[PDB]
Design a protein around this ligand. Structure first.
Ligand SMILES: NC(=O)c1ccc[n+]([C@@H]2O[C@H](COP(=O)([O-])OP(=O)(O)OC[C@H]3O[C@@H](n4cnc5c(N)ncnc54)[C@H](OP(=O)(O)O)[C@@H]3O)[C@@H](O)[C@H]2O)c1
Ligand SMILES: Nc1nc(=O)c2nc(CNc3ccc(C(=O)N[C@@H](CCC(=O)O)C(=O)O)cc3)cnc2[nH]1
Ligand SMILES: [Mn+2]
Length: 159
């Protein structure tokens, strides 16, 4: 089953110029937790921002151009991407924006981190119709010495 994980700022802003503006240690932790051991899907842009392969997970890169790195798996389509995933309990769709757009409809569960902070960006997380989603988990966090802003981790499962 497919899951979308994503870090959202105010206004569903997800990123700016291929990078995550803010600095939130608690977010990386969580991200790493829910991703580790599962395949991860991502776009070319996201691949690039990342720089190298996420350890402990199979990297699936979705692009219309040939790969150019044999350490990761390159696929040209949403279906291909899923086949490459094999039969596993969970697939992790990590963005960018376009990607996430492609997978929402297939997605069953959403892993969201709402960040309290105004950033101007160029990308947004798709607008998903609340009505169809059920929040099964929530956890707020006041800012701190490591995390410069307050945040919320949230888990949403389709109805
Ligand atoms: O963040 P961001 O949105 O800027 O970056 P991102 O989502 O990490 O990168 C987006 C991209 O991934 C590829 N992609 C997305 N959907 C695809 C599909 N259905 N089939 C093939 N390739 C697809 C394209 O790569 P290519 O530009 O390499 O085709 C596209 O420009
Ligand atoms: N919730 C959420 N948080 C994010 O930070 C986020 N980032 C991406 C994509 N960009 C990136 C860029 C770098 C690393 C990264 O180095 N991840 C490490 C965490 C390091 C740690 O263990 O604390 C990893 O390998 O999991 C992750 C995502 C996608 N969804 C997100 N979704
Ligand atoms: Mn139900």
């Amino acid at each position: 089953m497919i899951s979308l994980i994503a870090a959202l700022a105010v206004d569903r802003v997800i990123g700016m110029e291929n990078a995550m503006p803010w600095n939130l240690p608690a977010d990386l932790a969580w991200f790493k937790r829910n991703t580790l051991d599962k395949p991860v899907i991502m776009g070319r842009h996201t691949w690039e921002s990342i720089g190298r392969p996420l350890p402990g997970r199979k990297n699936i890169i979705l692009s219309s151009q040939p790969g150019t790195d044999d350490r990761v798996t390159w696929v040209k389509s949403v279906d291909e991407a899923i086949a490459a995933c094999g039969d596993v309990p969970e697939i992790m769709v990590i963005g960018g924006g376009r990607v996430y757009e492609q997978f929402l409809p297939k997605a069953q569960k959403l892993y969201l981190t709402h960040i309290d902070a105004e950033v101007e960006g160029d990308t947004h997380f798709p607008d998903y119709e609340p009505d169809d989603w059920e929040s099964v988990f929530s956890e707020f966090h006041d800012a701190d010495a490591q995390n410069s802003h307050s945040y919320c981790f949230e888990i949403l499962e389709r109805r």
